[PDB]
Amino acid sequence: NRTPRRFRSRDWFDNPDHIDMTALYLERFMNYGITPEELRSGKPIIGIAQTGSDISPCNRIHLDLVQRVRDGIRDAGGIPMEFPVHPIFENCRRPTAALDRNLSYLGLVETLHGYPIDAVVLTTGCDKTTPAGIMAATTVNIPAIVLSGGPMLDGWHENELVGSGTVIWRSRRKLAAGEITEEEFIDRAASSAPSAGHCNTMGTASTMNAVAEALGLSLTGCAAIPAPYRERGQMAYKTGQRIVDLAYDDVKPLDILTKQAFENAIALVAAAGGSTNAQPHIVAMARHAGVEITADDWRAAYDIPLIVNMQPAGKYLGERFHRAGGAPAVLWELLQQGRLHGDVLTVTGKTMSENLQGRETSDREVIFPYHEPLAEKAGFLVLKGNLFDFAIMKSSVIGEEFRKRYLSQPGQEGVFEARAIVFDGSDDYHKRINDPALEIDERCILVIRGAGPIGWPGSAEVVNMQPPDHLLKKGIMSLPTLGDGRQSGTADSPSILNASPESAIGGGLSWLRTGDTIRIDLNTGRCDALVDEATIAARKQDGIPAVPATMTPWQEIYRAHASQLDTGGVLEFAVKYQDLAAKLPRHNH
Amino acid sequence: RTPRRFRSRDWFDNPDHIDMTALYLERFMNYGITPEELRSGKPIIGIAQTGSDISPCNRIHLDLVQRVRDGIRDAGGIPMEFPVHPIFENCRRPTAALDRNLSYLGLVETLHGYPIDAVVLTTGCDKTTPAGIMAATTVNIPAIVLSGGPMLDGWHENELVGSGTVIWRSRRKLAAGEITEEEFIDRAASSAPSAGHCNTMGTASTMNAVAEALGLSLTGCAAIPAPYRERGQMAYKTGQRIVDLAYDDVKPLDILTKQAFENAIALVAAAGGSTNAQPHIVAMARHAGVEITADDWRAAYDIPLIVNMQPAGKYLGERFHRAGGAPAVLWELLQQGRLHGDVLTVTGKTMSENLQGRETSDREVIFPYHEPLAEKAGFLVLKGNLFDFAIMKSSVIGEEFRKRYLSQPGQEGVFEARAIVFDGSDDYHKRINDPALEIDERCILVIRGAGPIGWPGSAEVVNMQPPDHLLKKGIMSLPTLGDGRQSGTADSPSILNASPESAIGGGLSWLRTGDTIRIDLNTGRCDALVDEATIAARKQDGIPAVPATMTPWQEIYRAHASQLDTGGVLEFAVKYQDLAAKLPRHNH
Amino acid sequence: RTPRRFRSRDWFDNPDHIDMTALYLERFMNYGITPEELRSGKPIIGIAQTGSDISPCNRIHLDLVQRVRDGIRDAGGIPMEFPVHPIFENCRRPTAALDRNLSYLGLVETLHGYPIDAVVLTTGCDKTTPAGIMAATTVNIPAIVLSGGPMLDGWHENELVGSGTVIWRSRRKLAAGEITEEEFIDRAASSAPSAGHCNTMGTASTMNAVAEALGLSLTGCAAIPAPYRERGQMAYKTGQRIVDLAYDDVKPLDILTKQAFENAIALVAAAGGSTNAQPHIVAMARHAGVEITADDWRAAYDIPLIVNMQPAGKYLGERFHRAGGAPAVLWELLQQGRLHGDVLTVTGKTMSENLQGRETSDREVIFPYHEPLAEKAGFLVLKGNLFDFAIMKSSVIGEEFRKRYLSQPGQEGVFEARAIVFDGSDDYHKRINDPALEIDERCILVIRGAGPIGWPGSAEVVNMQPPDHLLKKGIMSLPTLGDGRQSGTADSPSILNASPESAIGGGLSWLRTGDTIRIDLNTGRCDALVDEATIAARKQDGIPAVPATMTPWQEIYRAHASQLDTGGVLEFAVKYQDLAAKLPRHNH
Ligand code: FES
Ligand code: FES
Ligand code: FES
Ligand SMILES: [Mg+2]
Ligand SMILES: [Mg+2]
Ligand SMILES: [Mg+2]
C-alpha cells in the first residue's frame, strides 16, 4: 500500500539547502510535546480544518469528533494538525452568511498552501462550510476528504415532527392566521433543535453534504449520519485512516472533480428534493476546479423524480433518511436508471458504481422507487426572460393546492399570468405586505429585489415571502414568489430564485414596477414582464433602485469582486488560481 | 445566599491553625484558581464524575460536566470535579456487583476527607446510582443526582432493538439456528447507537427513575436520552440547584424518609422496573437508617404496569421520555392515592407540587392506571423451605407462560415443576443440552452459587433459556429460579435474589435435580417437596462448592457483604450515619 | 512483532461464547470506536488516570494523557483511559495515608476485571506511585510508570521557596514573630507556581525517582518539571514503549527483584529522599513477594548525600532535572559499585546501558560520590525497648544539631534527653508552650497515637518544632521521636515510623513525660531508661486512648493495616500474586 514519498512538509522539516531554516521550522511545533521523531520520520502532516465552535453550533460536534479523526490518522501512519477557519453560522450571521463563504475560502487556501500541510480533512456541516472547504482545497489541490457533521435528531412538538427551518416558515403563517401565539412560536422553534448537528430537514446543509458524497469527496454513507450517532464517530475514524492513503497515492481534488462528478451531484440534488442554494455552490466549486457548469446542465436534471420523503418537500427528517440508506441509497436508484456516471473515481479508491453495490434502500416509506416516485419533474427549472437571464424554481416543493390554482387551467397548463407586487428588500416587504392599499389577491406574484450578491450585499434568504394576512385567513397558503435573492434550503415555497443579473447591477428586475403583469411558462422555461420595449427604457432612465451603503471592510471587497449567482457568487479574480500546491512558496527568513 | 459557614472553611479559612490554612490553600491554586475563589466563602461543590473510556454508559458526563460547572458558577459556588471507582456493568468480570460497595467506600472517603460542601452525583450505568446515593447519605452533605440518560432507539431491519434484551432474544434465535454468529454480534451493535446507558427499562433506567421518585433529582431528570440537548440543559439547572441546596442545607437524610422509599417502590412496580432495584433500594434505605421489609414490597404487588417499554412492553427510552418520562408515571400513581405527595424533594417543592401538569402526552406509551398494560406488575415476594426471601418479576409473564403454568383449573396460580439444578452458569451451558436430563416443558431451571458470597458478588445468570430442542417446539421459556440475579433487561419471569443463598446454607444448597417445586403466587410460597428427614440426610453431605476468593477485594467482600434481601451492603457500614456532623483531624 | 493472544481477546473474541463476545463488544463502541479496533487483536492499553480538579499535583496528566494515547496508537495499541481513587496529600483528612491501600484495591479490580492487556500508571502526588505499582504487581500484566513531574521553581522576595519546606520554615518564623499571618499564606502560595507535585525532594520527588530506579519507567522520566515540553515528549515515548512491553510480555514480577529494590534503597539515601519511601518500598516489595528487612536499610546508611536539593540541600526540582536528574544520581552510584547495573528495565536495556553517558552536567547540584555534600546520609535504623524498628532522617542533620547532641568528646553519636510526650498533634499545639513543662535544649519531643491504627493511617505530625522560648534563644530544633511520620519536605532529623506504634501496645504506650531516653547512633539503639518494674506497672494502667473509628473504610483499615515497618499494607492482600494468570468468570 505505502510507498514512501517526499511530501511538501519535508521542505520545512528536512530542507536540503537551508538547515538553519529547518531548525527554525521544527523548533516551535514541539512546544506542546510533539517529538522530533514525529516531525522528521517522513510521515505526512494531515491538516484537520476545524469548523466547530461555540459560535457555530451546527458544526460544533466536530469538537468531539476531531479526536476520532486524529485516531484514524495515527493508526494509519500520519501526523494530525488541527487548525481553524473563519467561523460560519448561517442562522445568526448578519447581514447574511453568504458573505462568509468566500472569506473563509481565502483563509483556508492561505493556511493549506502556507504551512507544511500534505493532506487535509475538511470538517463540514452548516450550509456554507462544505463549499467553502472544497473550494479552498481544490485551489491548492492537495489530497482532501470531507467529513460531515450530520443533522440533528428528529424534533417533536405535541407528537408531531418539526423540522429545523421549516418550522419557522410554517409558524410565520400560523402566527399571522392567529392560530399560535408568540411563545408557541419560540417553543416550536426550540423543539426543532433537539441535539447537536445541522438542520435536520433536506436544506442546504443536508444537500451540500449529500453533494460531497455524490461528488466522490467523502466516504460512502458519510453525508446522512445524524451527528449524535456513534456511526458518526466511527465514520470520523475511518475518514482519518483514509486521508493518509489519499496522501500516499496522491489523489488530489482535481483528479476527482471532473465535469462528470458534478453531473452526478446535480442529479442527486434533484432526486433528493435538495436546496436551491446547491446551485450557486455547485457552480462555485466547479469553476474553482476549472469546470464549466451551464444552464443546460441544470435542464438536464429537471425530469428527475423526487424520491426522498423528507421535509420540506416531504414528510420525514434526517434520522429516517439515514436509516433508509441516506445518500448512497438515492444514488443507487439513479445509477440503476443510467442517470449516473458510475465509472468516476472517488476518495474511497473505488468507482461510484463500485461504491453503490448493495445500497438499495431499506425503507420504501422514505426513499421511493424511481419508477413509482413521490412527484415527477423534481429538478430545478431554469427560467429565462426579459427580467433575468437565469433563475431557478423549486419544482420539488410545488404544493397540490398551488398546482390547482395556477398551473392547472384547461387550455394553458404550466402557464399563468400574475400581477407583480414589488418590494425593495426584506424590511420593505414586512412594512407594506399587509397594507390594503395594494389590494393583493390570489392572482398576484410577490417580488423582492436588491437581495443579490451586490445589493444586500451577499445574497440573502428572503424570497420565501408569505401571502398577506387576509389571504392566509382565507386558507390561501402561498402565492407565487420571485426575487434576485435566495431562500432557506428549508423553504417549502416554489419560488423563482437566484435571478441573475440582480436588480442592483441593472438586471431586468431593476425596472419592474408593482401592477405589471408577469407571465410564467413552465413548459418552455420562460418568465416575462408584459411591458413594451418603449416603457422599459423610460423606467431604465430613472435608474437602478437604491441599495444600502457598504458597511464593513469585507463588504467593500466582496461587492468589488463577487460574481452573480449565475456563476456561483465567486471571487471572480480568484478562479484564475489553480493547483497552487505545484509551486512552493519562498522561505520566510 | 445567607451566607452560612460551610465545612470547607475549616480548610480554607481556619483562624486557629493559620499554618494549615496556608498548607490547604497552596496547591489548589496550581492550575489557576484565584485566592478570592477559595477564600470568599462560596460553597465548594464536588462533582462526582463517573464517566470514562472504560465507562461508556456514563461517558456522556465527560461532556455534561462543563454544563454542571457553568450552573454552579452562575449560582455562586465553586465546582470541584473528582472521579470515583469505575463501573461498567457489561464488561466487568466476575460481576459489577462487586464494585458498588467498593465505589461507596471511596466516595465516602472523598466527601468526608476533603473540603466539599455539597456534591453533584453523576449517574448512569447500573450500579453507579445506588453507590452515589449510599455514599452521599452516609456523609450527609447536600447532594443531588444528575442522570446521564439512555442511548437513542436502536433499529435493525426496521425493528426496535433494545440494549440487553437483544442479547437474550438473540440467544434463543441462535440456538434455533435462525441467525448466524456474526449476525448475533451485528444486532447487538445495532442496539447501542449513541452515548448513554441501556435504552430499555433495565437497571439504569429503573434506578435513575428511582432517584427521581426518591426526590433526589430535578423533575424529569431520569428519562432524557443522553444525547438530547435537554440533557445538557438539565445538567446546567442541576448545577444551579446544588448551590441552593448548600445554602438551604437540604441533606440526604432530610429527604430519604420511609415515605420517599415507599414512593420509589410504587414507581418500580408501575414502570416494569428491574428486580435489581430491590437490593439497591434496601441498601439505600439501610444507609439512611430506614427499614424496608418484605411487606413493603408486597404492598406494591397490586400496582399495574403503566409504561409500555421493553422488556415488559414495546418501546425504548426515547418514547418513554417524549411521553413524559418518570413524572408522567408518578402523576398516574399520585392520582390514585398511591403516592405520598407531601414529601420534600431537592426541587424545593413537594412531590405533589412537582407533579402538577405532568400527565402523559402519549397514551400508547404510558397507559392509564385504570385500564393499564397489565395488573399486578409489582414484584411478588416468595418464601419457603428453599429461601426466606425471593422476588418474581411479575410484569414480564407472557401469555404462553400464563397459559402453561398459571392457569391450572380450580387451582389458578399454583403449579409444580421438576427442578434441574446447576452450580454456576458454566454448568448450565455445559449440561442444558445433555439429553440425559430429559427436560420437558414442566421443568424449572434452577441455578445456585451465584449470590453475594457464592460467585462472589451476585451474578446475572438466572435468565436461563430452555434447551435447544424445546426452543424448536415453540417453548420460549421455562420457569427459572436462582440465588443470583438477572439483567434488568431480561424478559424472563424469574424468581430471583434468593436469600439466604446456597453458599451460606440456604435451602438451594440441598436441592437436587428431580425434586419437585410447588410455586403458588396466591400464598407467596415456593417450596421443594422433600421431607425434613431427607433434607437432613442431604445437609450432611455439605454445601456445594463455590470458587476460591481470587482478589483482595473479593476477600473483604465475602467477609462483610449481606444477603440480597438486606441490600447486599457491607454489614458493618450501615451503622455509620451523618458523618459530616463531625470534622476529621488535621493531617499535619 | 510476533502475534499474541492477549487476555482482552477473552472478552472481544471468545471461542465458546459468542453471546458474551457480542455483549462485551457492543457498548464499547457507543462513543465511536470501530469494530476493526476491538477485534484486530491489538493490545488494549489501560491508562490509570490520577489527575483531576481535586488532585492538583497529578492534574498535569489530563493534558499529557493525549500524548500517551498518541504514542500507544503510533505503536499499534488501543488506549483505554480510566480513573483510580483520588489522592491529594495536602488536603486529605485525617491523612492521605488511608488512601494508598484503598486506591490499591480499586485498581486491582479494574486491571483484573476488564479486558486490559497492559497499563500505563500515571503518578505524581506522594501515594499514587506506590499505589499504582502495588496494584500493577498484584495483577502482574505489563506495566510502566509515567511521572507528572515537579512544579517549577518557587520564588518569594528573590528567594527559592520549596513546596512543603516553606511551611515548616514559616511555622518557626511565626512563633518568633518575624512574619505576619498573611505573608505566611503568600509565602506558601509563592511555593506553588505551576502544575506538578512538590518541587523539593519530598515523597513525590522521591517515589518517582524510586520508580525510575526500579526500572519501572523510562530513563530520565522522574525529574522533568510538569510544564516542560520534555514531559509531554516523555509521555509519548511512554505510550509507545508500553505497547512493546505488552507484546514482549515484560511483567512487573520480571523487573521487581530484590536487586531492583536494593537499587531503589541506594538511590533514596543518595538523593536525601523522604523517610516515607521506607514504608512504600517495603509495601511494593511485599506485593512483589520480596522480603525487605531492616538490614537492607542498614546497608544503605553509609551512602553519601549527592543531591543539593531542599530539604537537605539548596536547590529545587528544576535544577535537579537540568543536572541529569535521577539518571545522574544513579550513574554516581554505579561507578562506585553500589548498583546492580545489569538488572532489567522497562527500556529493554539494562540499568547500566541506561546510564551510559548520564554523568551530571552540573556539579553545583549533583555532587561527586567522593567529594560529596555529606556522609552517612542513608536512613539509620534504631531498635530499642520503645519500638522494634524506627528510622532517622540522617540526611537533614544540621550543623547545630550535630554539635548540641551528637558531639560528646567521649562518645560521639550518643546522647540522653528528657521525654516530653504528646498524644496526637492537638495535644502538642495546646501544651508545647505550657511553661509548666520546663522544656529546655536537653528535651526530646515525643508524639504517639499516630500510627496506622492510632490516627488512623500514619500521620505526618512528628516534625514538631521547639517551644517559642527556645526558638527565640536561637535553638532551631530539638530531637523528635514518634510512631507517626513527617512530610518528606521536612528538614527535621526526626526518628520516625516507630513500629509497633503505641496504639497496639508498643513501648511508647508506657513511656511518660520526664523519662530519660538514650539514643546511640553507633549501635542503632534507642532506650527509655526505666526499669522493668515500672514498665509492668504502667502497662496495667492501659494503652493511651485514640479516636474511635469514624468512616467505614477506616474500620476496614484499622482491622487489616500492618505496621509501617512491614509497609503499612493490608496484610491479607500480599498473599495474592500473579492474578492475571487466572481468568475471572463471565458476568452473564
Ligand atoms: S443553521 Fe447551520 S445548518 Fe441551518
Ligand atoms: S451496561 Fe451500562 S447500563 Fe447496562
Ligand atoms: S501535595 Fe501532592 S505532592 Fe505534596
Ligand atoms: Mg442557508
Ligand atoms: Mg446489570
Ligand atoms: Mg506526604
Residue numbers in the entry:
A (entry chain A): 3 to 591
B (entry chain D), C (entry chain C): 4 to 591
Original authors' sentences:
Enzymes belonging to the IlvD/EDD protein family are widely distributed among bacteria, archaea, fungi, and algae and in higher plant species. Pentonate dehydratases from the IlvD/EDD family participate in the non-phosphorylative oxidation pathways of pentose sugars in which D-xylonate dehydratase (XyDHT) and L-arabinonate dehydratase (ArDHT) catalyse the dehydration of D-xylonate and L-arabinonate, respectively.
D-xylonate dehydratase from Caulobacter crescentus (CcXyDHT) shares 42% sequence identity with RlArDHT, and the crystal structure of CcXyDHT shows that this enzyme has a [2Fe-2S] and a Mg2+ ion in its active site, similar to RlArDHT. The structure contained a tetramer in the asymmetric unit in the space group C2. The substrate binding site is located in the cavity between the domains, but the [Fe-S] cluster and the Mg2+ binding site are located entirely in the N-terminal domain. The quaternary structure of CcXyDHT is a homotetramer, similar to the homotetrameric structure of RlArDHT. Although the residues that participate in the binding of Mg2+ and the [2Fe-2S] cofactor are located in the N-terminal domain of the first monomer, the polypeptide chain from the second monomer covers the active site by extending its N-terminal helix (residues 21–33) into the first monomer. In addition, the C-terminus of the dimeric counterpart protrudes into the active site of the first monomer by placing His591, which forms a salt bridge with Glu463, in the active site. The hexacoordination of the Mg2+ ion resembles a square bipyramid in which Glu92, Asp129, Glu463 and a water (or hydroxide ion) are approximately in the plane and another water molecule (or a hydroxide ion) and carbamylated Lys130 are in the axial positions.
